[PDB]
Amino acid sequence: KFPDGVQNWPALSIVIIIIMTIGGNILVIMAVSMEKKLHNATNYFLMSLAIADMLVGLLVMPLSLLAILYDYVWPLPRYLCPVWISLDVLFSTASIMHLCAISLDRYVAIRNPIFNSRTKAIMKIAIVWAISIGVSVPIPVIGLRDEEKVFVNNTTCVLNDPNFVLIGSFVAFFIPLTIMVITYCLTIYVLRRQAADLEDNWETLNDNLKVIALTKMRAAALDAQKARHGFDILTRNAYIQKYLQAINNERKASKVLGIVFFVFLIMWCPFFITNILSVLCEKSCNQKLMEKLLNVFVWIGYVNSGINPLVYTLFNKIYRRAFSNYLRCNY
Ligand SMILES: CC(C)COc1ccc(CNC(=O)N(Cc2ccc(F)cc2)[C@H]2CCN(C)CC23CC3)cc1
Incomplete structure (x- = not known):
């Protein structure tokens, strides 16, 4: 930004997306560090992911915006x-590895x-980061x-080599995404099956208590006990709420992980489909449209790297209360 020679000034309005x-x-990184209730494997994974996404916004996004300012020259x-x-x-x-690891x-x-x-x-963070580095280093x-695999027509900076x-x-993209989807579906299937035993029997006994009937309660607790001693006596608060809360917290976490994975693949699919289709027909296709669409799909994929913190805010009291108190307390 000299700024002499610029061509697209309204593009500067993208700085908000970067900010x-x-x-x-950062709010995730500040959270999983300063909040003791966020110290575990999955949340440390999320801190690593937040580091990766913040670095996207810090190094990948600003150069792309600068290129947009100079009309992709x-x-x-x-x-x-x-x-x-x-x-x-x-x-x-790294992101698509982290999620693939988390699933x-x-x-x-x-x-x-x-x-x-x-x-x-x-160890898992090191493995996924090493995979990311191994993919990046050849570029x-x-x-x-050969400056022709990264420059197109001597001015535009895009990856050019088809293979x-x-x-x-x-x-x-395709292998990590496939592993992510298959693992998530199998996980959400097994979880329902394991939860189903307790929740069905518990619902039976709870409905029979809701009537006052009582004869239909004993076998439900028997089946729940089979699936520990909180049902043998039968009171409802302690053992029920304990085990039932544990199941439901997992269900919420599965929802959050599914939403993160699904926002990711929805936001990154347009760019990848368009690129692999632009090379599926090296000729016979309208390449100008492909480039113009890709120039927006790339930024959709970029913007995906700033949405996961909002998912945490919308589905975590810890992260939300963190973010608010961190914003006001620090500045
Ligand atoms: C020499 C070989 C081994 C490595 O060569 C590679 C070639 C393509 C890919 C797929 N990755 C992308 O298409 N990305 C990054 C990305 C990475 C991971 C994702 F999950 C999503 C996007 C776009 C993102 C937008 N950038 C402007 C250009 C781009 C860099 C090309 C990965 C490695």
Whole structure:
């Protein structure tokens, strides 16, 4: 931004999207650190994800906005177009790995449940980050070696090599997304089955108590006991509310994880479908429209990196109360 030579000033109004992308994720990072009730494997995963998304807003988004200002004619030195692209390939990938891990271990938690949690979480964070780095690192070598895989028509900074686009999309989007979807569906199936036994019998006995009838209560508690000693006596508050609250908290967490995964794939599918379709027909297609659509779908995918904190705010008292108190107390 010299600013001499700019071409699209209203694009500066995208800074708001950037400002919230960092801060919201910061609010997650401030939360999972300063709130003791957020110290666990999944919330540490979410802190890592917030770091990745804040870095998206800090490094991937601002260069894209600067390029938009100059009408997609790379305004920075030529050695920064590869880096930026690779940084994209890094941070976004981490996200789709983190979610894929969050849905995977969860499934591996439900199947065969049986170091410490706060350390195996570190191991998984390291694994997903290393995968992201391994995907990102080749891009600068390819770009700085052959500047035609990262520059299109000598001015536009987009990934150009077809084989790399396809292979990276299949190994960084389609495989992680597929694992995420399959694991989440199997998880949400098994959870319903395990919960079903207790909730059906409990509903039977609760309805029979609601009448006053009483003869229809004993077998319900028998079946619930079979599925510990809170039902053998039968009072309703303690053991019922204890085990029933544990099930429902899990249901809420499953809803949140599904919403995060689903916002992610909904917001990133347009860009990926459009790109792999722009290469499915290297000719015979209208490439101008493909590029113009991709220039907006890329930012939809970017904006996905600032929505998960709002999901936490909408479905967590801890995160919401954190965010409010952090905003007012710190400044
Ligand atoms: C040399 C090979 C191994 C690595 O080469 C690769 C090629 C493509 C991909 C798929 N990833 C993307 O298409 N992204 C990042 C992304 C990453 C992960 C996601 F889950 C979503 C998007 C877009 C995002 C928008 N940027 C402007 C350009 C882009 C970088 C290309 C990954 C690796």
